[PDB]
Write an enzyme that holds these catalytic residues in place. Structure first.
Site, short mmCIF file in Angstrom:
data_model
loop_
_atom_site.label_atom_id
_atom_site.label_comp_id
_atom_site.label_asym_id
_atom_site.label_seq_id
_atom_site.Cartn_x
_atom_site.Cartn_y
_atom_site.Cartn_z
N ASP A 1 0.86 -1.22 0.00
CA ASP A 1 0.00 0.00 0.00
C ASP A 1 0.89 1.26 0.00
O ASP A 1 0.49 2.22 -0.66
CB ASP A 1 -0.96 0.02 1.21
CG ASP A 1 -2.30 -0.68 1.05
OD1 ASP A 1 -2.51 -1.35 0.03
OD2 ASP A 1 -3.17 -0.51 1.96
N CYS B 1 -2.63 0.31 -13.49
CA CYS B 1 -2.64 0.33 -12.00
C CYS B 1 -3.84 1.19 -11.61
O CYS B 1 -4.87 1.06 -12.27
CB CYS B 1 -1.27 0.76 -11.47
SG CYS B 1 -0.54 2.23 -12.27
N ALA C 1 -3.71 4.98 -11.61
CA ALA C 1 -3.61 6.10 -12.60
C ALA C 1 -3.03 5.62 -13.93
O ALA C 1 -3.23 6.31 -14.94
CB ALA C 1 -2.78 7.25 -12.04
N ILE D 1 0.32 5.21 -14.54
CA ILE D 1 1.62 5.90 -14.80
C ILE D 1 2.72 5.42 -13.88
O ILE D 1 3.93 5.47 -14.29
CB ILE D 1 1.45 7.43 -14.79
CG1 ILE D 1 0.99 7.97 -13.44
CG2 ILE D 1 0.50 7.85 -15.88
CD1 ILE D 1 0.95 9.51 -13.32
N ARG E 1 3.25 2.35 -11.04
CA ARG E 1 3.58 0.90 -11.20
C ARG E 1 3.59 0.50 -12.69
O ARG E 1 4.46 -0.32 -13.12
CB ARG E 1 2.59 0.04 -10.41
CG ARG E 1 2.57 0.39 -8.93
CD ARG E 1 1.50 -0.36 -8.18
NE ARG E 1 1.25 0.27 -6.90
CZ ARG E 1 0.26 -0.10 -6.06
NH1 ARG E 1 -0.56 -1.09 -6.39
NH2 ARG E 1 0.12 0.54 -4.90
N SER E 2 2.63 0.97 -13.45
CA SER E 2 2.50 0.65 -14.89
C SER E 2 3.77 1.11 -15.62
O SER E 2 4.28 0.36 -16.50
CB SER E 2 1.28 1.33 -15.48
OG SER E 2 0.04 0.75 -15.05
N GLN F 1 6.27 7.75 -10.72
CA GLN F 1 5.59 8.84 -9.93
C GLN F 1 6.47 9.37 -8.77
O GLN F 1 6.14 10.50 -8.25
CB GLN F 1 4.28 8.33 -9.33
CG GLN F 1 3.13 8.37 -10.31
CD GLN F 1 1.83 7.87 -9.69
OE1 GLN F 1 1.66 6.69 -9.40
NE2 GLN F 1 0.91 8.79 -9.48
#
Ligand SMILES: CCOC(=O)Nc1cccc(Cl)c1
Length: 284
Positions: free
Chosen positions: A181, A215, A217, A219, A221-222, A262
């Site tokens: 998390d 994921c 958003a 941006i 993890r993706s 991010q």
């Protein structure tokens, strides 16, 4: 400069925040005018994350062609990816329309439906074989065929039916279920193994449409997933593996979708991923 040395030099100097801000400053800025039209406000999860007009995926319908999704086309690595937000209650039918129209074989999910006590994306696939889902707005049916639950990820076989033509296709759903998390994983071992399980499947291969990756958003993890994959493919292809510059690959990918990676911790994890990737393949 061998990235493993660049890594220790940044770590010993504690400059991760400074490197990350340099990337943010040099990143491309292109218009996202379609994303900001008033008719599209309920098609966007986050007001500050939009696809660029030049690279957005278009839905094949005359009504409204808009979805929060981007085509990342990596010319030298010969890989393409679609990066998208987690589907919203009113965009689950658009999501599966896109998978159908783009001829994707695989969906890669890097989040849980609930994280930090809040909903991060809609429950967009069926949880039981005998309870299929119908998307009436896009004329699609989705059935759960099988589910394989492992310690760090789940793989599902799904059947997507175009109710207009009665064609069916098998879609594979790769669900990474253990990203914490807060922060990033301590070791990249389970993430790299996940990537290897997606590769093994054929989902990233040129005989299919681009993989869909999300994921919350689409941006963070993706971004980490496509950056690690492309960097390891380039280190396989080139005569000089040490020429692969992860900061330059990330700036190339940011021409196609804003905001990829991010945080400074996601940037360090991406380095660790590629660095640890190169061993178990090359040296020991
Ligand atoms: C030349 C560098 O190529 C790699 O390091 N490839 C690789 C390593 C570990 C895991 C996965 Cl999935 C791919």
């Amino acid at each position: 400069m061998e990235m493993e040395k660049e890594f220790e030099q940044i770590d010993k100097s504690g400059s991760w925040a400074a490197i990350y801000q340099d990337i943010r400053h040099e990143a491309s800025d292109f218009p996202s005018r379609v994303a900001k039209l008033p008719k599209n406000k309920n098609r966007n999860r986050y007001r500050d994350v939009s696809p660029f007009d030049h690279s957005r995926i278009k839905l094949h319908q005359e009504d409204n062609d808009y979805i929060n999704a981007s085509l990342i086309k990596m010319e030298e690595a010969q890989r393409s990816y679609i990066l998208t937000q987690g589907p919203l209650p009113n965009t689950v039918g658009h999501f599966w329309e896109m998978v159908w129209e783009q001829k994707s074989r695989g969906v890669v999910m890097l989040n849980r439906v609930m994280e930090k006590g809040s909903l991060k994306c809609a429950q967009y696939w069926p949880q039981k074989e005998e309870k299929e889902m119908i998307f009436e707005d896009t004329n699609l049916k989705l059935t759960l065929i099988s589910e394989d639950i492992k310690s760090y990820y789940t793989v599902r076989q799904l059947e997507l039916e175009n109710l207009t033509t009665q064609e069916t296709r098998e879609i594979l759903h790769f669900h990474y279920t253990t990203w914490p998390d807060f922060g990033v994983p301590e070791s990249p071992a389970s993430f790299l193994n996940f990537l290897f399980k997606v590769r093994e499947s054929g989902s990233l291969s040129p005989e299919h449409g681009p993989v869909v990756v999300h994921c919350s958003a689409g941006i963070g993890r993706s971004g980490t997933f496509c950056l690690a994959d492309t960097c390891l493919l380039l280190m396989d292809k080139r005569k000089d593996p040490s020429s692969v510059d992860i900061k330059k690959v990330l700036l190339e990918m940011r021409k196609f979708r804003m905001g990829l990676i991010q945080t400074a911790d996601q940037l360090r994890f991406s380095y660790l991923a590629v660095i640890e990737g190169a061993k178990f393949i090359m040296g020991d």
